[PDB]
Amino acid sequence: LNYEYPYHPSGNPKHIDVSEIDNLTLADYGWSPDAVKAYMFGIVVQNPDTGQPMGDEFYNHILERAVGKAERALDISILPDTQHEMRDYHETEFNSYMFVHAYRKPILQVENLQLQFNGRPIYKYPANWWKVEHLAGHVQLFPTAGATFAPQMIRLEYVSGMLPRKKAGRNKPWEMPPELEQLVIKYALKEIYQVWGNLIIGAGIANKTLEVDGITETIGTTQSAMYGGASAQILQINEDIKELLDGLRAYFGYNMIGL
Amino acid sequence: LNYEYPYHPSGNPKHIDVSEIDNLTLADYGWSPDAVKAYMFGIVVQNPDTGQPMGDEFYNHILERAVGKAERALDISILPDTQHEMRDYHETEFNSYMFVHAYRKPILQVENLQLQFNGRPIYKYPANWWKVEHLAGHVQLFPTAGATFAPQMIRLEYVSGMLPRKKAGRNKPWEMPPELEQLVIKYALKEIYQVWGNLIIGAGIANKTLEVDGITETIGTTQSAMYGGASAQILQINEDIKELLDGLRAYFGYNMIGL
Amino acid sequence: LNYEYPYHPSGNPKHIDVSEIDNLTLADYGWSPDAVKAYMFGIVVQNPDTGQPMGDEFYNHILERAVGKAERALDISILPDTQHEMRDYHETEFNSYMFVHAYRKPILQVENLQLQFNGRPIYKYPANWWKVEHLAGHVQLFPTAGATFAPQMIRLEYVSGMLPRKKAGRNKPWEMPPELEQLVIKYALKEIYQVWGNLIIGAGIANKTLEVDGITETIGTTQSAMYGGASAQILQINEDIKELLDGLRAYFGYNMIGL
Amino acid sequence: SGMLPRKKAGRNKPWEMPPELEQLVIKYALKEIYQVWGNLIIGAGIANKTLEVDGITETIGTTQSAMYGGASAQILQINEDIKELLDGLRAYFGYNMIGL
């Protein structure tokens, strides 16, 4: 075997280059204004004072915040980032093959793992000892060869995040599931419908009739004193979000810790 | 007695030839587009853009999927197929006259039964020992003369499915009950009514009035903001399905296993 | 007996060639825009400002996400893919004929199985020892001849997925049920109905009346301040999805693990 | 196995079909025939109609509605009759039992 040093092919296979984490963008995961507009096919949002359509700056803003919402509704790291953690010694888990659970998951790869004292490395574990479980967020060592805890004894550096899926309809444990993309889209779309619901009719109108010289024109709109113009669409989007979240909260597990 | 080898007249009587399982078709069980159209007597489904009636390809498609639904709402094999199973040794059931429960039922006939080791037959049981209970899905042996389990010791081949009934109003345990046919029909019909419900009026219309020069024409349709055009028929079909399923889930028993 | 090496005819029969996993497509499973459009016979989805029909790219996108959703509502792998797993040693299950449960099911075939240490094979199990249960997702060994657990001792390679069924109305345990196709279709169709429900009528209109020079028209739409134009169809599709999911969650079992 | 048709009016031997089971089977058939017929009483999918032409005016309200089909009432009554008959017949035949 030959490999780039930390990335032992069995225990810590390389999944991404540290150059690519700066090159990946939201558009590479398919989150783009065009996708939102596709879900709003046959609708256009434009300023009634000017006819100007809504700018892609707003779409990208909403998309980035929707990504943040998805990254907090589930205890996951969606976008690749380098994580540096200082973790505590605990006797039970240290005896349990040096078990540590990362704060962020999935793990793309582990970059460094050391035992240290006042920042001095006391030991540097050989990379061939590192065992990584990517979707779980678990790291262990399997060596080839006065108190129960102490603070910040373990120094851990790793890359968290998810890669874009390589094939249609499929994902590896380190690849974003196809439906989490749709969840983020639904979160963005739920905001866009709230914007659009103000512009179907003049402000604050639920009904109008206008008649001139016996020509009569009359409208009942979807607005009402209770429900906004986009009420039904938002309700449906919330149902879809509920189904998607149930599915994804089955894919990622329940959080647990041993006291 | 004389018989074709595996089909001992008492313990494993022959009910079908292995040539016929390729010749049987859905139409031989009476599932046909004409039957569906009979339940939709006095209605026609046609494309309003062309007047073309709906093609029998769609009916046969829906029928085949309705058969699949019926085969999963009940833990049964409707259509004849050859099953090959590798079954585990369990000490209690092996001592209980070599009891095995087939994964699929009814049994039309058992084709082979052997005890084996790495695919080598260790013993081939004489066909005159085989005891079959067809509707239950049970096979036993009644010989004329370090662990509690082991994987895939038993090799079993059999035909599962049901035959079309020979007489009106009657069925043998290996023959399809007359009402399971109607259940499959009701499942198909529930889809056809969902298609038809879109075409009774122009899209999205609940009411119209049109008046020209004092001639007045006015319609209230069965569509509404809540209920679709075929709501009532689907509700009735669901009631009928519920009655049929209760009856058939009394005919086939509750599933049980001994741990 | 003669066979391609890993694929012992009794314990691990070959069901697919590794060339075909690149060639199979959504269309081979009957997921196509036309298969969706068939369920909306007599409707067209059409931009009211241009008359252009919606492009099939959106249909394919929705289908690929609907497959992802179906693969998360049920704990299954639908489309064939090659899985590589490093699995932990557990003493109880290792003693239980080297029992391992795959993360993904069904198993089409096992490609490699080894016990290893830092990537070195410590032993390579003869293929004639491998016992596979495909729909369960179980692998065991039946040999011909200081701690309770250790990480990543077992190396397992296999193909997960389902093949398209070979006969009408029937599936082998490694073949896709006919009703799961209908489930994925219904998931796509729910989204297409959400799109189309905005376009049946002028946006945000619940009632209209126009009177001009002795011609009068009044229309009530299925749109309302509470319900969108396609509410009814979506509700019925959700009922169908619920029935299908109950059936499929009876076909696949409840997940269980021994702690 | 089976039953013979009864030899006297209003009476059955234990091997003869009860008169009410005949009515049960009739009611089961009739429920389906009413489901068919309930689509045809009126133009398909019409709940209300009004027509006015040259001083002739007609308005019709049908038993069809966005909730209920045209034969809903008859089917409901037939289901009540079926329920009564089934209670009676499940008193005539006993509860199933087995010794384990």
């Binding site: 398919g30 783009s32 065009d34 996708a35 596709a38 874009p164 899926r165 094939k167 249609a168 309809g169 196809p178 993309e181 | 309003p48 075409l199 009774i200 009026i201 122009g202 024409e217 319609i219 | 790219e57 959106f58 394919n60 996108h61 289908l63 690929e64 | 133009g43 398909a44 999918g45 019409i46 109609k49 027509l51 032409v53 002739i56 007609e58």
Partner: peptide, 20 residues
């Protein structure tokens, strides 16, 4: 390979009821 990402119904009088 790559993931896909971006009538007739007539009104008429009942003439028998008109005769009645």
């Amino acid at each position: 390979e790559k993931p896909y990402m971006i009538y007739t119904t007539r009104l008429e009088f009942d003439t028998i009821d008109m005769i009645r």
